[PDB]
Structure formats: structure tokens, C-alpha cells
PDB file of C-alpha atoms in Angstrom:
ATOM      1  CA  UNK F   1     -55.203 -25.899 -23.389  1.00 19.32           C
ATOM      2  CA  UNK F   2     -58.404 -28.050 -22.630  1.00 23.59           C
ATOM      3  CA  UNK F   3     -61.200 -27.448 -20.306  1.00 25.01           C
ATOM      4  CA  UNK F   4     -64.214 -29.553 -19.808  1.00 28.37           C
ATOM      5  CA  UNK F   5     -67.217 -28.563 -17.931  1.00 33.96           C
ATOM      6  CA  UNK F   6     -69.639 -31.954 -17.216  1.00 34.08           C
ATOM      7  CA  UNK F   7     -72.493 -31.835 -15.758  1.00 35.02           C
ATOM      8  CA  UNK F   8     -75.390 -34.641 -15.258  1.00 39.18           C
ATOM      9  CA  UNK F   9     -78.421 -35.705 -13.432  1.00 42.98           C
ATOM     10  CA  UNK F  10     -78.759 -32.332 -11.725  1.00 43.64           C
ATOM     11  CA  UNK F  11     -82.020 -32.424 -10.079  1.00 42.54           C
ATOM     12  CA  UNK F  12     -83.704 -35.132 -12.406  1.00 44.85           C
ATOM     13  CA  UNK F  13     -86.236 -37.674 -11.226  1.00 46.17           C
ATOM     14  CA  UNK F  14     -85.303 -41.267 -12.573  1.00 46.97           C
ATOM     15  CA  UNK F  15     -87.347 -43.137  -9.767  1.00 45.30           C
ATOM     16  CA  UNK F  16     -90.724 -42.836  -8.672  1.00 46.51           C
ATOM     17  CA  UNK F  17     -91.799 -39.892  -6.451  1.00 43.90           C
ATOM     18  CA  UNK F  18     -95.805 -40.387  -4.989  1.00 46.18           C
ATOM     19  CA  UNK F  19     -97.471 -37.803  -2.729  1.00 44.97           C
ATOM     20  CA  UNK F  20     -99.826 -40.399  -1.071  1.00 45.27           C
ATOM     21  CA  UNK F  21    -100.805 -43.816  -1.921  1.00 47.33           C
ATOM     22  CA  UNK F  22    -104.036 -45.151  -0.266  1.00 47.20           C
ATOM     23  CA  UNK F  23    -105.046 -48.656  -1.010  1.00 46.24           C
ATOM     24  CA  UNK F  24    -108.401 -48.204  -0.123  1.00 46.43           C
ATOM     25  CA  UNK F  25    -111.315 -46.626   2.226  1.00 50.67           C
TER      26      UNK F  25
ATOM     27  CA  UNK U   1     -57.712 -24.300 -27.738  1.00 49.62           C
ATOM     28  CA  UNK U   2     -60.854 -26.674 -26.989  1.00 51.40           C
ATOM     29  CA  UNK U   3     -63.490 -25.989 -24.816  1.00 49.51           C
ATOM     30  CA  UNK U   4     -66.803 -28.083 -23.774  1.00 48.62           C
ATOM     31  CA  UNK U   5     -69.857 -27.181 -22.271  1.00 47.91           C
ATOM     32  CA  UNK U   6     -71.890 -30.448 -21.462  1.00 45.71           C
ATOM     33  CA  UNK U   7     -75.220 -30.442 -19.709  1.00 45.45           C
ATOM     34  CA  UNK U   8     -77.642 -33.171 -19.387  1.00 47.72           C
ATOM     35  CA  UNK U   9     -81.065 -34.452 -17.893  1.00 46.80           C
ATOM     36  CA  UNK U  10     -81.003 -31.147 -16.057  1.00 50.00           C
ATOM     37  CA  UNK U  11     -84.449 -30.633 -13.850  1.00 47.21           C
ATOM     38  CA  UNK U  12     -86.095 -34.121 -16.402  1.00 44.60           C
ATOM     39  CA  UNK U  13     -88.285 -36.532 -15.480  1.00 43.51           C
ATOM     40  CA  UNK U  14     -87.739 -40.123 -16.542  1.00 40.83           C
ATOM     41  CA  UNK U  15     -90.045 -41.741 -13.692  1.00 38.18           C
ATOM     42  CA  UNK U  16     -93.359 -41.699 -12.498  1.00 43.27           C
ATOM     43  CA  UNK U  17     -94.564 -38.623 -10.708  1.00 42.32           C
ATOM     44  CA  UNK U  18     -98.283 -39.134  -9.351  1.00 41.62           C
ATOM     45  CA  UNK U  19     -99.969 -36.708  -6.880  1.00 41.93           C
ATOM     46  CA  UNK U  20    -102.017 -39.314  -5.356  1.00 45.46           C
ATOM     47  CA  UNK U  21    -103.107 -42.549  -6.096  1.00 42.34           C
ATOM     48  CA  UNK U  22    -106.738 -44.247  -4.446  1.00 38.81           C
ATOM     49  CA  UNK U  23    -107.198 -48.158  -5.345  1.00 40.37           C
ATOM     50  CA  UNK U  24    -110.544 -47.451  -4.385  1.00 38.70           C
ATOM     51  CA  UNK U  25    -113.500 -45.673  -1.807  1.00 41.09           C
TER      52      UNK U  25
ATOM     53  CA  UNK M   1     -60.510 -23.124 -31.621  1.00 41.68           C
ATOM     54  CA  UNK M   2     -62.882 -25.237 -31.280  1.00 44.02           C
ATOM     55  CA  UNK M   3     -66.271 -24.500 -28.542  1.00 45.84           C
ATOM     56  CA  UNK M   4     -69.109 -26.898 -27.809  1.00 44.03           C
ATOM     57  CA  UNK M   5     -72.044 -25.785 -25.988  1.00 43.32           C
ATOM     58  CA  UNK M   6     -74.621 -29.053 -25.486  1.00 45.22           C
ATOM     59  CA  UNK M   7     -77.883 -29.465 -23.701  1.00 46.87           C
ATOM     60  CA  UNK M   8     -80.191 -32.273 -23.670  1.00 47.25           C
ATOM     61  CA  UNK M   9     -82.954 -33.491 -21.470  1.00 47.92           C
ATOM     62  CA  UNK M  10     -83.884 -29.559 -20.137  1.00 50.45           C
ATOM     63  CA  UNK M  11     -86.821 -29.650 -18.108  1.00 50.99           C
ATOM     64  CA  UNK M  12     -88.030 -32.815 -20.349  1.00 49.68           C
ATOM     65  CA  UNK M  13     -90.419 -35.128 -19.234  1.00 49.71           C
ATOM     66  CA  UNK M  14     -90.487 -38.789 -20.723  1.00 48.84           C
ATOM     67  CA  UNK M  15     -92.411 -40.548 -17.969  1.00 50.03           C
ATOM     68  CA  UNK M  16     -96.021 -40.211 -16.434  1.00 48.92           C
ATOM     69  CA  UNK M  17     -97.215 -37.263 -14.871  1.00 52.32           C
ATOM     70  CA  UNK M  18    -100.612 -37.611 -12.817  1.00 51.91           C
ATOM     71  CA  UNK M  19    -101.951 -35.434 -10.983  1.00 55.21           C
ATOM     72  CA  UNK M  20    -103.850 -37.521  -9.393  1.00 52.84           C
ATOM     73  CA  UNK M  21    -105.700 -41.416  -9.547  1.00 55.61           C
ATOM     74  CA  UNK M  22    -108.707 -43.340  -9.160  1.00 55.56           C
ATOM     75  CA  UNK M  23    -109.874 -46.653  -9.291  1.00 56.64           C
ATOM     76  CA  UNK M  24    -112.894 -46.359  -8.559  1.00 57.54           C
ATOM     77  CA  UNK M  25    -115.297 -44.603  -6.042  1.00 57.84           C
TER      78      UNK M  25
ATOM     79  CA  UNK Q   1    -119.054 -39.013   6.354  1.00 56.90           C
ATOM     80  CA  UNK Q   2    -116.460 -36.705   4.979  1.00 55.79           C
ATOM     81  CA  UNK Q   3    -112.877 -37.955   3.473  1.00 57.55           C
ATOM     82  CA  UNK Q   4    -110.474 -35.570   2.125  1.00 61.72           C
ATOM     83  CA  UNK Q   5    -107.362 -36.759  -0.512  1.00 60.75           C
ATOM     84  CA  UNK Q   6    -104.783 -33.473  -0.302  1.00 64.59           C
ATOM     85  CA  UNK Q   7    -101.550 -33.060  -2.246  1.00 63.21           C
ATOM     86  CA  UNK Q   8     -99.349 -30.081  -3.208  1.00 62.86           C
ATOM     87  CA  UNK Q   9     -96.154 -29.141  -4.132  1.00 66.58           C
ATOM     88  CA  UNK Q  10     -95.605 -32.683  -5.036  1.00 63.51           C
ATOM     89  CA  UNK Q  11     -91.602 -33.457  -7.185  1.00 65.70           C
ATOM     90  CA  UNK Q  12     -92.284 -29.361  -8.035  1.00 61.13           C
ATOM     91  CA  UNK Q  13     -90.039 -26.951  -8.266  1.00 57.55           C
ATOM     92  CA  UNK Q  14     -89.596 -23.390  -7.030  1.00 57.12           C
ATOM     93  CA  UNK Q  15     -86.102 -21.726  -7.145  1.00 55.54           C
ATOM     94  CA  UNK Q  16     -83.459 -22.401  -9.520  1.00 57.54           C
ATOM     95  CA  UNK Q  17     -81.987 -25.522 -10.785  1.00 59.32           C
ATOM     96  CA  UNK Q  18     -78.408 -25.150 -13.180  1.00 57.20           C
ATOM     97  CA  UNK Q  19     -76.849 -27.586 -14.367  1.00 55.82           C
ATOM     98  CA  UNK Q  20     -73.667 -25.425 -14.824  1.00 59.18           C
ATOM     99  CA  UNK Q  21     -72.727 -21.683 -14.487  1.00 60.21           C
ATOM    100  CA  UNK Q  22     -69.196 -20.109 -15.235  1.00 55.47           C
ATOM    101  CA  UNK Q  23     -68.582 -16.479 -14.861  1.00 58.48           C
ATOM    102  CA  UNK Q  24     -66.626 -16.841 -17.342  1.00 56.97           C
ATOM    103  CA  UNK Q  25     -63.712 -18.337 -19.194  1.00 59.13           C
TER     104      UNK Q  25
ATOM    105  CA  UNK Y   1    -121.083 -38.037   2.120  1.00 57.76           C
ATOM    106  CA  UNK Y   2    -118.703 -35.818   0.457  1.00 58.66           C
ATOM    107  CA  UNK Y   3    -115.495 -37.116  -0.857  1.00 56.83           C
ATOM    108  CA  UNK Y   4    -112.748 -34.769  -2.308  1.00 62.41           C
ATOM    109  CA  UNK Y   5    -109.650 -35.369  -4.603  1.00 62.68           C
ATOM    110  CA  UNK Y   6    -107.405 -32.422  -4.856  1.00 66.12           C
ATOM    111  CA  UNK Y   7    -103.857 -31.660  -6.401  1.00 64.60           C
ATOM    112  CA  UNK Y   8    -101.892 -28.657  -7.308  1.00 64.97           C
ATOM    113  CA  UNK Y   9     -98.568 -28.158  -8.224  1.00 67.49           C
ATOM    114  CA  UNK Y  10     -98.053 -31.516  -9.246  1.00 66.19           C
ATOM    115  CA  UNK Y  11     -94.516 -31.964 -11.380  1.00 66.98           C
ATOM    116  CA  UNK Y  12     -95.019 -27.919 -12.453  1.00 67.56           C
ATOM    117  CA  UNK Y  13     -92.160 -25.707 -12.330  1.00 66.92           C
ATOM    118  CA  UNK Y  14     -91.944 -22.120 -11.282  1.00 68.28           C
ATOM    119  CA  UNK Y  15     -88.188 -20.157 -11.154  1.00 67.82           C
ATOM    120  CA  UNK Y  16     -85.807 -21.054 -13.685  1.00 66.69           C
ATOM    121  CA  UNK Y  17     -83.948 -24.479 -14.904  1.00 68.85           C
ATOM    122  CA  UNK Y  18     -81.170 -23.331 -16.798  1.00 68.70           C
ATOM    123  CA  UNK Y  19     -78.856 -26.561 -18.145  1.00 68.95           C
ATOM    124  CA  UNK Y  20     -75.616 -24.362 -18.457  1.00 71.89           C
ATOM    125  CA  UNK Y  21     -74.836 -20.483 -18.416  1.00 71.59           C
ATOM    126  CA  UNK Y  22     -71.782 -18.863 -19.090  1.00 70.85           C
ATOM    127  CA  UNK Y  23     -71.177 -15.303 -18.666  1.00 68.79           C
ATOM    128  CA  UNK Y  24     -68.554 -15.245 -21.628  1.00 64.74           C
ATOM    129  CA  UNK Y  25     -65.662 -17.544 -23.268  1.00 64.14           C
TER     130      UNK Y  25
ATOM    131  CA  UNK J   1    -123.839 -36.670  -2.326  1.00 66.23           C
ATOM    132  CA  UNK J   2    -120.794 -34.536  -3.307  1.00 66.72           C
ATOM    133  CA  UNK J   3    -117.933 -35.591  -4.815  1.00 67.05           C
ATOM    134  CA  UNK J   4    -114.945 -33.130  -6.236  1.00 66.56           C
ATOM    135  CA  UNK J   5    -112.454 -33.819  -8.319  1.00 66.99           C
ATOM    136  CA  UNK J   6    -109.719 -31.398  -8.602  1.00 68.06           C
ATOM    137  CA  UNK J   7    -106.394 -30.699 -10.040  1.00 68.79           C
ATOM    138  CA  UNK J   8    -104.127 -27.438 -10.949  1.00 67.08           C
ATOM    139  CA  UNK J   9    -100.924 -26.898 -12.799  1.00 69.48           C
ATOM    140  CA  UNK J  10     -99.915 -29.982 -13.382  1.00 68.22           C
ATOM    141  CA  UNK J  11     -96.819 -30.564 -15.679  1.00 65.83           C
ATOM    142  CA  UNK J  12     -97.180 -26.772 -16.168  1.00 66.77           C
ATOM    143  CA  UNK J  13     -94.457 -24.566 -16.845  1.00 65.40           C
ATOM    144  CA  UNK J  14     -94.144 -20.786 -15.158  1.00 63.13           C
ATOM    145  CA  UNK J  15     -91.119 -18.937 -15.520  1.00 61.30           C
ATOM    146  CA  UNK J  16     -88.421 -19.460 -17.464  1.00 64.44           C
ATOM    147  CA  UNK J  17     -86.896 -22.884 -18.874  1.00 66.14           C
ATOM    148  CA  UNK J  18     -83.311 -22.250 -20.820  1.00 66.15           C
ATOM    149  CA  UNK J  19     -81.105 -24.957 -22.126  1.00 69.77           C
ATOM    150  CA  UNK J  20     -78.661 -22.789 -22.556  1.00 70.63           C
ATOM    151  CA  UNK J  21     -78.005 -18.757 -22.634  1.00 72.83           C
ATOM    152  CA  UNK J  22     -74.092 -17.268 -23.381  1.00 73.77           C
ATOM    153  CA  UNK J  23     -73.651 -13.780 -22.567  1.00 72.66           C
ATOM    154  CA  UNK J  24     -70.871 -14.001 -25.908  1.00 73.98           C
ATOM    155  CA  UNK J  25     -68.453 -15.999 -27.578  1.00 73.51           C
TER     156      UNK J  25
END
């Protein structure tokens, strides 16, 4: 018997996350 | 018997997480 | 028997976290 | 003049993030 | 003139991030 | 002239972070 459970890049960030991006005022 | 629990990059951050950016005001 | 129980990368960062950013004002 | 630069919640988390769960084997 | 820069919550983590759980093997 | 600069759990950790919990082997 063999069981393997595998499990990967569950909610990970591996990109670019930005609230707001203003260039200027 | 074998058994294997794997888990990986589970809730990381490999990427740029900014709240806000301003060039300038 | 034989059990493996791995985790790697748990709630890890290895990017930039800002909370926020300025170039000038 | 008045500027405001507002962020929250920004890639956070709130609630629960698993990579695996078994009840059991 | 009154200029404000505000963040909260930025990449923080509240609630769990569990990579594996097993009730019993 | 007012200026504010403001920022609040960032890359903070509340609650509970686990790689990995067994109830038994």
C-alpha cells in the first residue's frame, strides 16, 4: 500500500499584488 | 506500508506586495 | 513502515513587503 | 487642498488557509 | 494643504495557515 | 502644512501559523 498526499502553491503570492499605484499629483 | 505528507509554499510570498506606491506629490 | 510528514515555505516571505511608498512629496 | 492615499486589507489574510487536512488515515 | 499616506493590514495575517493536518495515521 | 504618514501591521503575524500539527502517529 502507498498513499501520497501533494499539495502546492495553496494560496501563495508569486506575482506582484499593489493596492494603488499613483504616478503622480 | 509508505505514506507521504507533502506541503509546500502554503500562504508564502515570493513577489512584491506594496500597499501603495506615489512617484511623487 | 515508513511516514513522511514535510512542510516548507509556511507563511514565509522571501520578497518585499511595503506598506507603503514615496518618492518624494 | 486636501489629498488622501488609503489602503487596507491589501494580499492579507483572514480565515484559514491549509494546504492539506485528512481526518485521518 | 494636508496630505495623508495610510496603510493597515498590509501582507499581515490573522486566522490560521496550517501547511498540512492530519487527525491521525 | 500637515502631512501624515501612516502604517499598521504590516507583515505582522496574529493568530496562529503551523507547518504542521498530527493529532498521533
Amino acid at each position: 500500500q502507498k498513499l501520497v498526499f501533494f499539495a502546492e502553491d495553496v494560496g501563495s503570492n508569486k506575482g506582484a499584488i499593489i493596492g494603488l499605484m499613483v504616478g503622480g499629483v
